[PDB]
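FAQ: What does a ligand-bound record look like?

Like this one, built around 2-acetamido-2-deoxy-beta-D-glucopyranose:
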Amino acid sequence: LEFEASQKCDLVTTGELFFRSGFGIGMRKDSPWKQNVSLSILKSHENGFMEDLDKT
Amino acid sequence: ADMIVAPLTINNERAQYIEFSKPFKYQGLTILVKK
Amino acid sequence: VQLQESGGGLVQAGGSLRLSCAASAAAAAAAAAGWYRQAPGKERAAAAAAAAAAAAAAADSVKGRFTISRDNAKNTVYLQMNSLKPEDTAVYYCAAAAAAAAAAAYWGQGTQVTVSS
Amino acid sequence: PLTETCVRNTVPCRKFVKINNSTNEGMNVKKCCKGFSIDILKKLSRTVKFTYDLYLVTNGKHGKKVNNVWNGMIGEVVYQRAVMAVGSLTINEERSEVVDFSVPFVETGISVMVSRQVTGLSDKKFQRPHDYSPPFRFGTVPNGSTERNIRNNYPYMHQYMTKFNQKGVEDALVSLKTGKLDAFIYDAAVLNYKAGRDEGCKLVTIGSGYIFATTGYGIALQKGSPWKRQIDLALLQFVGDGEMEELETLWLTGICH
Ligand SMILES: *[C@@H]1O[C@H](CO)[C@@H](O[C@@H]2O[C@H](CO)[C@@H](O)[C@H](O)[C@H]2NC(C)=O)[C@H](O)[C@H]1NC(C)=O
Ligand SMILES: *[C@@H]1O[C@H](CO)[C@@H](O)[C@H](O)[C@H]1NC(C)=O
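The answer part, i.e. the structure of the complex:
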């Protein structure tokens, strides 16, 4: 909604966030990929490529 | 399939079966009005 | 409380030994037992541990050379060590902590283990 | 001292001491402790049926992996000192390498605090102190979590930070107020609090709550323990029930808000 309001003008959002959550990838239980993907995503976030893509 | 890469919210109803790990972008809830 | 360590000697490289530390107490179920090593010129280092629950942690440095065991019936923890290397030459120590007490760091006289050709 | 205890809704905890002048003895003195992070487990352990005791830290503040050895709560857990570990703990790449972490419950990161003139980590002012004006200073508490992260990307700033290192927290803020420093760097989850419960609202964070390297706070447990599934599911459940907001309000007040 924030991005849509930024792009499509004349629309505004009212009120502060009344909830907290997070977005994330999902895998089927007991899958091998989970440990490494979780380990690597943190390193990527620390590096800043995720931060750089945001402004883009 | 064996993975999902989409803006998925993490909640109790999903955490029972599929293990979502290490959130990469935090977000909340808002409301839209015309102005 | 007071403990007592023993089991050292001289053994050729690749050999084995059985070190042991023991103490007297009526509550012996609940004590962390840890092994410490301190060579000349180096700080004291952890080697092996045993938890109250019954889990075993081994240091990655010399992992696989030795093994730990505790007897709940008899108040003694003995360390079985195998495949000796010259890097292990030091004086090993035993210790306990928690379940009451204060001034918590307990150190025996010391047992020197020598590995050489 | 009215009854040698403290009021209900507070958990006792056995703080160690380094004795008096190290002459002898050293008394394990019972002194109850409270706060935010402790309150969450008190309500948490009413649905998982725990029995618990607390004892505070001995040496260091958080921890650092130096000379291939650890000390701190992270050092405590890796050597099985306690199955659980709570408090102010920061999730990061190095920490998760050796010990597992749960799902975070509060968002945070790093930020800068100044008195009463720059844009952030790319600001040209932070790049080099070779400007016309005399050099200014940084807070950057050593032996921390940010410092290891700060070393990772670009070094030349940190060697500048080596010359001037602050101590504690309260000691840093007064030094900024007097004018000994000019740019305090630390994690945002506490700087917003200190700026809030303050006098005159003279201290603020740059921008509209600008944040760098967003990160979460959580509870770390021993690797491979069966507690993992239960502690994760229960912690997520309270978030849905609208409990974090209520507990946040009591211990996160806004005077400048
Ligand atoms: C997670 O990733 C690491 C990346 O190093 C894997 O470690 C490698 O695993 C392969 C086979 O699984 C070995 O051939 C390599 O020698 C390992 N590398 C090192 C440096 O030891 C690890 O196996 C992966 N695990 C899972 C579950 O995906
Ligand atoms: C911080 O690091 C310095 C490095 O020399 C050390 O002397 C000091 O004791 C440390 N302080 C801590 C860990 O609180």
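Follow-up question: can I read anything off the structure? Yes, for example: Strands of chain B lie at 3-4, 19-20, 25-27, 31-34.
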